Structure 1
Amino acid sequence: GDRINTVRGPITISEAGFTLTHEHICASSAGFLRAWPEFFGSRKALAEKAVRGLRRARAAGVRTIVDVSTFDIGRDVSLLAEVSRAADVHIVAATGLWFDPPLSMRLRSVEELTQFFLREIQYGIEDTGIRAGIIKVATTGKATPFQELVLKAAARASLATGVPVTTHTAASQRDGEQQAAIFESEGLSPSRVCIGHSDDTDDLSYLTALAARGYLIGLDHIPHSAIGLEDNASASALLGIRSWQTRALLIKALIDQGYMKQILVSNDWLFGFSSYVTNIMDVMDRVNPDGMAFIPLRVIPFLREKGVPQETLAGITVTNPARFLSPTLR
């Protein structure tokens, strides 16, 4: 594990730099952007907007983002490669399945799914040769039967390739606990795993208990807040009413309990969003005009001000991501 695969090819571990580990260029659905690009204005408008945002994040110090859009989030790796080249920001692409698998995925065995993820990691996505650098999976509460198969196959693909696994959770339901049981049932090392959306909960005990076991804790929703828009139900349903400062203080809490090495921080931001209500992007961009730069422009200063040492901030934002993404065989 001395090389990370990006959408422009392999980079060395030290080239990754300041890394956002849970982002998206566009959250959509399989086939959707190519079938109905006008939903986003145009594919050109979407790309131009992504490049603007990536250029601003780059200005703020971001060197790499991990796009955790799976097949069923409508990942378009050709778009990723395009905006990565235009903005000069490294993008790591994902394989895996999120919670909108179509029938041709849903009906598949753990063995078939394992071959699919391996294809995307080892040989390349679609016909592009672009290899995924991470595996994304998801539950929303107790795993469905198919979701158990997805997590087992993600564990098998990770063991075979060294590529890490990262999760969507409903944190309020402590999904991370079931996810960890399943992964461990496959012999996967907890240090290969990031339990994501974990700042959606204030149950610190749930969080430290997982970190104690060696899991990475993805605090990737820091800017997600509907405060000031509580009368917009779709936004509050999506974003929650907890403030960004509250979410960021979980980072400090984890640090204070000794778990700085287990923390990964991100915005879970995006430049198009079709798998929710129309015009939701306009709401989100008003909520967080900084977009992906929110972590380096607002969160890191806030923590430093609350007394987090520069050294600890560099560890969380540079070191942990490098360790996590470096392909690492058991």
Structure 2
Amino acid sequence: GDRINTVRGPITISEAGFTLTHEHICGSSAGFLRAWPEFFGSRKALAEKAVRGLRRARAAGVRTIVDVSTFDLGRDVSLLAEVSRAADVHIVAATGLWLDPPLSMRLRSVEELTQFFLREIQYGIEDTGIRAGIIKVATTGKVTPFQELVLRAAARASLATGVPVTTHTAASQRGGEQQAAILESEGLSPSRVCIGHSDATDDLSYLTALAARGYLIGLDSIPHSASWQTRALLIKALIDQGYTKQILVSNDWLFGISSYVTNIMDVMDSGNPDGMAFIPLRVIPFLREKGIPQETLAGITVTNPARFLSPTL
């Protein structure tokens, strides 16, 4: 009712504060970080870079991030816990499945996947006792039969535990509509779902209609455009349509990445030196200078994630 699971344990809704709802410490693959830490220089080097990054973000106001790295994205909650403590920033961990499931996941039934998700939420991830506070799902534009199983399992897990669902989409294909239909067929409330990567489109009609059904709209990759201004104005556009309370904002940034061709991390960093501090240091002043009240911005960056993450129903 009033508590969410983080990598350091349970915390009250009040303690969450300014929350970036879609971020990554490391974008990788299952087992990869521990098998090949050298790829990131070293595990310590990666940990240190994250801590410095998170500390700057904290200096700029951020108090909580939701790491939406799944099993198949190389989620290492021990790394999350280590960097969360050193930086003193809350990190919410995720279960669910992204776009790279191995055979041992691809060949599972919806009932089996439901059990895996429940495990990571109710018991803990691996042997850590760290519990997931959100369920991530990724689909291609047209939802594949396996991705539909993952969607349904996520809905059933969410209905059993109250933790929310966040999605990866192709907004240019308007992927969120196919997902929503499947999720609702399972009896899941739109208020428990964030349709992610929605800032990668100019289709306001698509965005508003989803918001009007109660869905959280993930405008979560603003600096990837580094234009980034156009993405930010979608936040304004949705406010002006009256859907302030359905907006979630993030950077979708990373401190390490192996699930892409080599050297991309340095290109990203030089493209966006602010890292996860891009939202508080760049997007928020931009929105102020456009006439959005400070109180509406606080509602979006604090109150909305609070409402979204609190286990419900």
TM over 0.5: yes
Normalised-by-shorter TM-score class: over 0.9
Provide the C-alpha distance between the structure 1 equivalents of 2:272 and 2:244, rounded to a whole number of angstroms: 26
Alpha-carbon distance, 1:32 to partner: 0.3
Distance 1:323 1:43 in 2: 34
Q: Partners of 2:105 and 2:140 in 1: how far apart?
A: 18
Alpha-carbon shift at residue 296 of structure 1 (Å): 0.4
**Secondary structure of residue in 1 paired with 2:135:** strand
Deviation at 1:7, TM superposition (A): 0.1
For residues 84-121 of structure 1, the C-alpha deviation after alignment (integer angstroms, 9 at most, x for no partner) is 01100000000000010000000000000000000000
Q: Counterparts in 2 of 1:31-70, with a 5 A limit?
A: 31-70=31-70
Deviation at 1:140, TM superposition (A): 1.6
C-alpha distance in 2 between matches for 1:221 and 1:64 = 17
Superposed displacement of residue 129, structure 1: 0.2
- The Cα offsets for residues 140-178 of structure 1, whole Å up to 9 and x where unpaired, read as 211110000000000000000000000000110000000
Alignment partners' CA distance in 2, 1:178 and 1:140: 10
Query: How many angstroms does 1:22 deviate by?
Result: 0.1
**SS, match of residue 223 in structure 2:** coil
CA deviation string 1:165-223 (max 9, x = no partner): 00000110000000000000000000000000000010010000100111000000100
Q: Tell me, in whole angstroms, the C-alpha distance in 2 between the residues paired with 1:173 and 1:138.
A: 14
Q: Secondary structure at the match of 2:286?
A: helix
Name the SS for the 2:62 alignment partner: coil
Question: Deviation of residue 6 (structure 1)?
Answer: 0.3
Provide the residue aligned with 1:228 in structure 2.
none
Q: Distance in 2 between matches of 1:159 and 1:286?
A: 42
Rounded to whole Å, the distance in 2 between the matches of 1:282 and 1:80 is 21
Q: Deviations over 1:35-78 (max 9, x none)?
A: 00100000010000000000000000000000000000000000
Q: Does 1:282 align with 2:266?
A: yes
For 1:120 and 1:10, the matched residues in 2 are separated by 15
**Aligned partners of 1:115, 1:139: CA distance in 2, in Å?**
20
Measure, in 2, the Cα distance between the counterparts of 1:84 and 1:97.
23
Per-residue CA deviations over 1:9-41 (Å, capped at 9, x if unaligned) read 000000000000000000000000000010000
Residue 128 of structure 1 and its aligned partner are, at CA, apart by 0.3
Question: What whole-Å deviation, never above 9, does each CA across 1:291-315 have from its counterpart, x for those lacking one?
Answer: 0000000001100110000110000
Counterpart CA distance in 2 for 1:271 and 1:173 is 28
d(CA) in 2 for partners of 1:311, 1:81? 32
Aligned residues: 311
Distance in 2 separating the partners of 1:37 and 1:279: 16
Q: Match of 1:101?
A: 101
1:137 aligns to what SS in structure 2? strand
TM-score, normalised via structure 2 length: 0.99
1:306 aligns with 2:281: no
What TM-score results when the alignment is normalised by the length of structure 1?
Answer: 0.94
Partner of 1:20: 20
Q: Distance in 1 between matches of 2:183 and 2:92?
A: 22
Report runs of 4+ in structure 1 exceeding 4 Å deviation: none
Unaligned runs of 5+ residues in structure 1 are 225-242
Distance in 2, Cα, partners of 1:2 & 1:161? 13
The match for 1:271 is: 255
Q: Which structure 2 segments of 5+ residues have no match? A: none
**1-structure distance, mates of 2:285, 2:153:** 39
Shift of 1:322: 0.2
Matches within 5 A, 1:86-235: 86-224=86-224
SS for the counterpart of 1:202 is coil
Distance 1:304 1:187 in 2: 39
Distance 2:290 2:146 in 1: 43
Is residue 328 from structure 1 mapped to residue 312 from structure 2 by the alignment?
yes
